[PDB]
Amino acid sequence: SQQVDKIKASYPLFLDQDYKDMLAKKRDGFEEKYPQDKIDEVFQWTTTKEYQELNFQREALTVNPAKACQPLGAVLCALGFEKTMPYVHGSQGCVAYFRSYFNRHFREPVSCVSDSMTEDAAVFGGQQNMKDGLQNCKATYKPDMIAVSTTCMAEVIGDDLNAFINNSKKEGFIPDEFPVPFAHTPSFVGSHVTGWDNMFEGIARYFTLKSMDDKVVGSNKKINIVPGFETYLGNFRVIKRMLSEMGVGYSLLSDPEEVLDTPADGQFRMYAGGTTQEEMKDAPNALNTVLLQPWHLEKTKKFVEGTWKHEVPKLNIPMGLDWTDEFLMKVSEISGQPIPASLTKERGRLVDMMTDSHTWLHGKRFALWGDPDFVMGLVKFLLELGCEPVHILCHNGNKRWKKAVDAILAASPYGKNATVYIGKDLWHLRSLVFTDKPDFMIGNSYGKFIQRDTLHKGKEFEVPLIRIGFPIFDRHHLHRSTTLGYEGAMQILTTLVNSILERLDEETRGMQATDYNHDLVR
Amino acid sequence: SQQVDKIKASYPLFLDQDYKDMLAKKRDGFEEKYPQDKIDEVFQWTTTKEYQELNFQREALTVNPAKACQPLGAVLCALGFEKTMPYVHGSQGCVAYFRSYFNRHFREPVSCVSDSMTEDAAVFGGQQNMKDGLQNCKATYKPDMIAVSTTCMAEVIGDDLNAFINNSKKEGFIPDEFPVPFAHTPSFVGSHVTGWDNMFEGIARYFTLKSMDDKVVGSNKKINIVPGFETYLGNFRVIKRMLSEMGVGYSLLSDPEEVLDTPADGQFRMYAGGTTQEEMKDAPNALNTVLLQPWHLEKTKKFVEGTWKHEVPKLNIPMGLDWTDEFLMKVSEISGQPIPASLTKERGRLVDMMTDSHTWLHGKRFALWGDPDFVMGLVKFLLELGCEPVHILCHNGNKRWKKAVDAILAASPYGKNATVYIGKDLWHLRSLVFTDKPDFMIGNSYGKFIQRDTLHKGKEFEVPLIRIGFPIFDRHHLHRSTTLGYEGAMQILTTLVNSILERLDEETRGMQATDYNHDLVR
Amino acid sequence: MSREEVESLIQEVLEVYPEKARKDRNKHLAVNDPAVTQSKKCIISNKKSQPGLMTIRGCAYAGSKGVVWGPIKDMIHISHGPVGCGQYSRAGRRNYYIGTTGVNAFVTMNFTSDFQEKDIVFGGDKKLAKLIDEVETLFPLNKGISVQSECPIGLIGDDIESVSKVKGAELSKTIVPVRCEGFRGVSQSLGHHIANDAVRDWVLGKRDEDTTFASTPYDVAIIGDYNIGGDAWSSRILLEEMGLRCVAQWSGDGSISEIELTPKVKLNLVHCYRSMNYISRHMEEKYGIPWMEYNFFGPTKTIESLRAIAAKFDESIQKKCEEVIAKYKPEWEAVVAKYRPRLEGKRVMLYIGGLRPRHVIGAYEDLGMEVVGTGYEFAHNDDYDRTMKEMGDSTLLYDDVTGYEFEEFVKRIKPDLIGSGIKEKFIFQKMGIPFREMHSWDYSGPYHGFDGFAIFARDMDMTLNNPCWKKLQAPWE
Amino acid sequence: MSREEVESLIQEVLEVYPEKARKDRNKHLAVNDPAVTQSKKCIISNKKSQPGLMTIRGCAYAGSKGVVWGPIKDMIHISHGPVGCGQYSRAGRRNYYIGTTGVNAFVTMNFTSDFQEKDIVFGGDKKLAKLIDEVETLFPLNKGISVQSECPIGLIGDDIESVSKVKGAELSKTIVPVRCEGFRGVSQSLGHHIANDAVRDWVLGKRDEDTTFASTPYDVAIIGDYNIGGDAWSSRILLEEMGLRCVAQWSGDGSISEIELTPKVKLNLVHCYRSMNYISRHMEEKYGIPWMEYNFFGPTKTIESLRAIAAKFDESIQKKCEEVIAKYKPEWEAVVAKYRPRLEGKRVMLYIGGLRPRHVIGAYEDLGMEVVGTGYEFAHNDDYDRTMKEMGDSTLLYDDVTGYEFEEFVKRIKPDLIGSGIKEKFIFQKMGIPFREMHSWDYSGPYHGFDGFAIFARDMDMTLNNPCWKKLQAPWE
Numbered sequence A, B: 001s002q003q004v005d006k007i008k009a010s011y012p013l014f015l016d017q018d019y020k021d022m023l024a025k026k027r028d029g030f031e032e033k034y035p036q037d038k039i040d041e042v043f044q045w046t047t048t049k050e051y052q053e054l055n056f057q058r059e060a061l062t063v064n065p066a067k068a069c070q071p072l073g074a075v076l077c078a079l080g081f082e083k084t085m086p087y088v089h090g091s092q093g094c095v096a097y098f099r100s101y102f103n104r105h106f107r108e109p110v111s112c113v114s115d116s117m118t119e120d121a122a123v124f125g126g127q128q129n130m131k132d133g134l135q136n137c138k139a140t141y142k143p144d145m146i147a148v149s150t151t152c153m154a155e156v157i158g159d160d161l162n163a164f165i166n167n168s169k170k171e172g173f174i175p176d177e178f179p180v181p182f183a184h185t186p187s188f189v190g191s192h193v194t195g196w197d198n199m200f201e202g203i204a205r206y207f208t209l210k211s212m213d214d215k216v217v218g219s220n221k222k223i224n225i226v227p228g229f230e231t232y233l234g235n236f237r238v239i240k241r242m243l244s245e246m247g248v249g250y251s252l253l254s255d256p257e258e259v260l261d262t263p264a265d266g267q268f269r270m271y272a273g274g275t276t277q278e279e280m281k282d283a284p285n286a287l288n289t290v291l292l293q294p295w296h297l298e299k300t301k302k303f304v305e306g307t308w309k310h311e312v313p314k315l316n317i318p319m320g321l322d323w324t325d326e327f328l329m330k331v332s333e334i335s336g337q338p339i340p341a342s343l344t345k346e347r348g349r350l351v352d353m354m355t356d357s358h359t360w361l362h363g364k365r366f367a368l369w370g371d372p373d374f375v376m377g378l379v380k381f382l383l384e385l386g387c388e389p390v391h392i393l394c395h396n397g398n399k400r401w402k403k404a405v406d407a408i409l410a411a412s413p414y415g416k417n418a419t420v421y422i423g424k425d426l427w428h429l430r431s432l433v434f435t436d437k438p439d440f441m442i443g444n445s446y447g448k449f450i451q452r453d454t455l456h457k458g459k460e461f462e463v464p465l466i467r468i469g470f471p472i473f474d475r476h477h478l479h480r481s482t483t484l485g486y487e488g489a490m491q492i493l494t495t496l497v498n499s500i501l502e503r504l505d506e507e508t509r510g511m512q513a514t515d516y517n518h519d520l521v522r
Numbered sequence C, D: 001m002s003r004e005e006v007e008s009l010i011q012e013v014l015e016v017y018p019e020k021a022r023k024d025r026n027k028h029l030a031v032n033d034p035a036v037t038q039s040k041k042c043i044i045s046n047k048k049s050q051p052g053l054m055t056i057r058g059c060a061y062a063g064s065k066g067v068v069w070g071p072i073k074d075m076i077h078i079s080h081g082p083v084g085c086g087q088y089s090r091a092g093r094r095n096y097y098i099g100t101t102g103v104n105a106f107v108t109m110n111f112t113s114d115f116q117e118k119d120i121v122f123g124g125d126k127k128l129a130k131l132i133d134e135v136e137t138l139f140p141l142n143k144g145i146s147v148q149s150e151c152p153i154g155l156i157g158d159d160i161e162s163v164s165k166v167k168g169a170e171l172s173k174t175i176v177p178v179r180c181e182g183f184r185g186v187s188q189s190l191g192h193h194i195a196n197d198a199v200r201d202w203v204l205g206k207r208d209e210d211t212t213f214a215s216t217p218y219d220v221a222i223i224g225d226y227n228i229g230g231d232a233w234s235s236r237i238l239l240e241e242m243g244l245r246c247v248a249q250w251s252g253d254g255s256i257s258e259i260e261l262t263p264k265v266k267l268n269l270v271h272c273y274r275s276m277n278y279i280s281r282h283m284e285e286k287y288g289i290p291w292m293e294y295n296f297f298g299p300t301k302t303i304e305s306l307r308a309i310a311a312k313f314d315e316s317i318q319k320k321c322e323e324v325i326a327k328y329k330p331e332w333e334a335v336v337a338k339y340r341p342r343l344e345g346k347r348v349m350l351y352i353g354g355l356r357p358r359h360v361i362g363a364y365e366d367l368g369m370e371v372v373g374t375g376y377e378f379a380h381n382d383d384y385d386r387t388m389k390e391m392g393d394s395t396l397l398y399d400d401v402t403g404y405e406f407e408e409f410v411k412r413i414k415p416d417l418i419g420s421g422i423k424e425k426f427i428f429q430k431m432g433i434p435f436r437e438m439h440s441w442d443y444s445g446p447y448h449g450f451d452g453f454a455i456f457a458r459d460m461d462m463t464l465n466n467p468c469w470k471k472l473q474a475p476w477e
């Protein structure tokens, strides 16, 4: 039953007595549900340490992973170029899923096409699919460039992208001068960040490999910036702003912040902004190349150091205080531009907030998960704040990254209780937060379920989640935030201290029970 | 007892069994406490409509006010000028309280002095106090200007500020050319915003009244901006940024943003930034003067219109889409500068966020309180978002402002259930949110107690608080936020929508009870 | 109106395509004629998509894992293959259920085999057996395992059926291998077909020799309702107050026991014909259970459906149906009185998967709103035969419409509201046209039945009449 | 350290003042000599502040309403006058209490008359009576009303004593008028005196003729502990473990009934001498109740105070005290063993109000820390008499220090830690020096007793050794 003046959505309409009785009747009659006591016993067992040993013995079963497949990152990289259409050679379901994922994260239209490969292509290959798809895409959406990646279908059947595109150009389906960079992105290798690296390397090789005779390093007095897989527009904006304040010439390669933040004014823009072909062709003439996320830009680093002959600096992600300082000094050394007073004042203001909130941050325990560079930068910043990471998880990390993270942790007295896990999923993290309870979790929206499970054990065992990372689906406009630089550090610090204070306020709201500590001033 | 590995502060140390037994023994032994049944009955009575009818009959008692006294606003205005020392003629306890208040809100040093008037001055006056205080302050803290306000003691006794300062200058206590503007700020009249207006009018009259013979309107091709009582640094910053993007000459008068955001780099800066004396002297030469908060700048408006011969535009606070558009168009008309494309794109992005969050924001009910201009701007923004303002409260509002806000509400279909209260305090609003429950409250930290009371009645009766306004004491670095322009509108929209989503997440976290609506994608 | 103008618009939109793409797409766009009962002579559907045209269709894995098998709550579903498929489809569809997640319910969880290069080169049958053992170890309260195949499984030659048979015999468990590789078929329709075939072959006939279930003449099953936002519950409550007994519910909030007990019911009430007609026809031929379709979109359609269902039983069910209609009449009359003045005269364009474009028409008309255009992603010709009689004259019909085609059609027609998926939501929002998500109900619902009609009307009003649509043009432009 | 250098520094700091201010301030700075017993010959205190020098002192209203009367929970305290004072003093002091706020407890609530211009011109006595009637109507469970005067009340011809007497006779309620106007005196100490006199005159003698309270030879009353962060509770439990019975605590978590029952106890354990010595002496002269000072800051002071209190009673209390000390020895020993190596050899300066500058020195010395400078805002000469023997050789002593003075002293001495109020906190934080709030315990605590010593050591370690103090200089400068 619904009242016209107060209509109830699914919550809490189904908490009404009639719906509750219907659900109880259904369960007791036709579901053959296990007894509630048995379910409670099994949940208690899953919250124990023995279940943790059984869980960490897994070798073939992955439960709730924290990574995606390569063509998603390839599409994200392709989106960062001017009037460039992402084109995935393979099945259309992959493209549908990529578009749905990016639409749910960014809340913006995402453009991508497929050649709709089927059983006929599973037997005879997808050469005709490639020809017709390239022709149709160019004729319909009029792109200046088509960036081609692959799905696991074409990777397994071993389709040859280079030969397919060459045949398409030779037979006249698309003009010979039309740029069609390509990359092989096997989803059974690596993750989405690997796909981003592969696509960027393919585009750079397409635009620079055959025309390096007339290139001189440092000729255009610019610095190349390669951001890598990034889902915060504020990060691109802060990098550009910091480079502009220093008066440093720069070329941001794969810049998608304009196409992922289009305005609503009555018209649809399929393309907006992005790196031009002139920038990509002139990139070898820069003084140097800086990779913002070096731990998933290895192929790009090899291509840049080998072909472009750029001595890429060994820089960590510009996250926190120390690494932002190191990035700024390296940029100043490379470009010969002094660091302006505005950046010094911003650093001092960040230090001031750190000094203000150190009392509330000290001693706090965090679980965290995400991509390798983001995770290691977050670990560094949390160490600088006096916080204690204990469970550090990275499903797409490797042994070298784990060694680097351990070296970072050993350098600080607050990293003595920290353990780094690579190749572990979120079921492992759920077991870890049950057996060794932290104060907070940091990660994407998939952690919310973990919090729910903790609340099932008790209010004293609940571990609140802080949404930093990708993807965030249950909150609006968090993709506009910043994690890089002093401004990103300030945003992260404000979020963390406010999460701590909201938890404290919630725990002390009981009248005559705990409200003696419900302080007005904190 | 304490464990050295896990040391407990007051919460939850005092929840131990021994402390609970000690407290219970004390209560049943010596406190002569009322029975818990009587306390519960009285609380339930205070949550009823009859109690609300009794409460609104109050005529002499004020319970939990939502305003301060004039000298606080006078101090805030004086802090906005370069190397200017706030000086309060009266008692030192007032200055101690002002400094503590601003220190807790801004988490920054606040400088203010007093002449420390005692019982002796109650019959002789504070002339010698003024002389000694001016001499000592100038000798010790080296200010370029001393801005004088008053406390209630000096106003009741009747100290002539002009005569006292003239006699101090005449007898050599301070140089005759030293600028010492003054203002009378009685605490029993108006509130802190009235004091801000009085102090600004006094400074303007000191620097411009007697030298208007050589002033020609529009000579310097600038627009004067008077912000009024503002406690968000982001508001100053966003006004400056928006005026810079338009390429519009401007002169912000009383800009305290630099002195309230000094960096922590190993030195203490007593003064930083602020309006210079040259700017205040050249202010009559501007094209026009724009008052960002015209509802507490009436004396300033009178002085600017009658003396500077400036045709002050009739503008609302640049809060929300429509009023930001009107402010930008008025500035463009005055200065003759076209509105840039960047501001158009930012407006479109705000409209896009509104479109994305309209489903979650539609129909939500808000109780709200604050200062008049901030309250009416937030009401306008809530009406623009499809939200329903229900309880609009302003302790320092007047009847003309009430008529204006009623006119704003009547123009929108979402203002049907909206009532406005002037002269009412937070006990009135507690009664209102008990009897006519809204979905959320918007206000300063003093609302937290109200939330506690609601949680005491039941979880289904709890009204969550959203901290937008002054002062915020229980959260860190919220004073850095923005509430003006498109940037402030986006920040407020994000805060509101994420508060709604977090409330929904909390209400649907129960396993096998309500977690059917614990959606990953919202 | 203006059928000639609609055809001219179709031609103008079609000019841009190359010769082969234009010729193929010409058969999938049509102008409605209610007098026509054979859509085969009018439109062509269930064909392959043209490459590189930004299609909206999914894959057979989405049709099988995401639609049919996924809502089953007491079963663990393994995405056999690389990590992406189960990650993008995890908790993406709001098929509501009651249970303890991770203990006895696993709907919003993501179980996968996490294929690597070695698994591709050397196969994943041994890995699948080890995974099944680990699943049984860590999740003892699960009541069945289904293994949903992805593209490399079908491309490398893995014998999932043998592994499922051996492991099911060993553990005395029901393990269902579903060959739902994404390259099979052209859309999710073949996924629905394959999932229904798997249900028939491995689950449906498990209690043919069992007769311990007490049967009543008023036993019915709900077929094709996936409990999107609680739709199945909202329909089931109406069926229950009518005196019937709902034994099974496929598949939202469904259990394997309900599926196995379905062949014991007296009537099948099919909600989604497109995705469940195979199993309903199989049940009719094998056990003799008649099946009939019902529409609970809006008061008129649910009155008609309730009366049609009650006609299948004796007089007592008919009296209970009349009593239910009388009880629920004032509520939807109040809803109509509140929300018809604000929605009268508006024009709607729709593009959904296979059932809702024709089901929601009556609900839209009960609010005084007219539908001028509709389309399907993967519907067959019988769906178009059903739809063509429910639409107005000279309305637009589009099958497997492209992004550009729908863009231009919406630009020319200029409706007041559009209902489609998440991939058109933000596009049409940036146009300035109100948009409603017709797959997830825009994170609202339910919309079925009387209780859902109020929510539907409130959502329609709150989106159509939102002030934000009036603020797109800056005042200085 | 190096007495001659300290005197030289004092002279350089004084060099900038005008002659009158310099001459006045010369008497408020001293170099400590523990051999000296009388402080009148070296330091001068309890004098008016020099105008325009940024003193940290408050007013008499703060010392009466905010310190003495505010912690009383079952009473309602009206701030008679304009709105600012109660607004700035509302919930700024962390005097913890147990009760239902708004029903039977009103500590964090702000009650005021909200004086306007008409109230200034025509008085506020009728408004006060109407306000008392409204308070009686809306808060029936209140057990007394206090009326704290602000500056205009004493400036205009208001007579609150007559109003209080008439309303108390009419309503049979205890109404205490406090003439704690701001301009009286020079600091909060006169507010302490006025509040104590009001307590003596209006509350203390209510049960003089009542003999229905059963009394035991082990009755003690805590005087001068205001339960900052639970501090009083952290003390009271210890007294309960010694076998004593605590009848009242003034005034944190205190009730009016406890105040009235105070004249029935056997001993008055006075914590804050400065604010409650008046009432302690009055009770000694009138009821013959002895009072002694105690110190629960740090394990050493706590043990000495427990032994001194136990020596005032029979042998059973002494045995219980020995058992308590033995029980609590390992905990504070472990706290020292953990935190002293991190804090050994550090130098600290303090600037607090009347009691704590000398009370917390022992707790710092228990951790291996040396206090090199100390000072008071509003202490008298007896406080400095105690401090001089409490403090070390060649250390710095300051009374009513100014912001400029404190900044110059801190720059010259360069301490590792500074403990002061909120008005110097950020000033010293920007300077790169760790700062702990010694009034509110930086929203932490309690710091009294054995359980508070652990929190104290943890806070000192967490602030002194924070990494943020090594990051204030940019690497490029």
Ligand code: ICS
Pocket (backbone or CB within 6 Å): C063, C067, C093, C188, C226, C228, C272, C273, C274, C275, C352, C353, C354, C355, C356, C357, C438, C439, C440
């Ligand atoms: S199953 Fe089908 S696309 Fe019949 S795949 Fe799709 S929950 Fe649609 S029009 Mo999403 S044939 Fe159901 C459908 Fe209809 S997921 Fe739902 S809304 S009634």
Ligand code: CLF
Pocket (backbone or CB within 6 Å): A069, A070, A071, A091, A092, A093, A094, A095, A097, A150, A151, A152, A153, A187, A188, C059, C060, C061, C062, C082, C083, C084, C085, C086, C149, C150, C151, C180, C181, C182, C183
């Ligand atoms: S059509 Fe369908 S969704 Fe596509 S793969 Fe095929 S079953 Fe799956 Fe998962 S991993 Fe990524 S998204 Fe594909 S490319 Fe390899």
Ligand code: CLF
Pocket (backbone or CB within 6 Å): B069, B070, B071, B091, B092, B093, B094, B095, B097, B150, B151, B152, B153, B187, B188, D059, D060, D061, D062, D082, D083, D084, D085, D086, D149, D150, D151, D180, D181, D182, D183
């Ligand atoms: S020394 Fe003390 S705090 Fe000062 S007034 Fe006097 S009692 Fe009070 Fe309240 S209202 Fe404001 S702050 Fe004053 S100036 Fe008039």
Ligand SMILES: [Fe+3]
Pocket (backbone or CB within 6 Å): A106, A107, A108, B352, B353, B356, C426
């Ligand atoms: Fe958007």
Ligand SMILES: [Fe+3]
Pocket (backbone or CB within 6 Å): A352, A353, A356, B106, B107, B108, D426
């Ligand atoms: Fe600060």
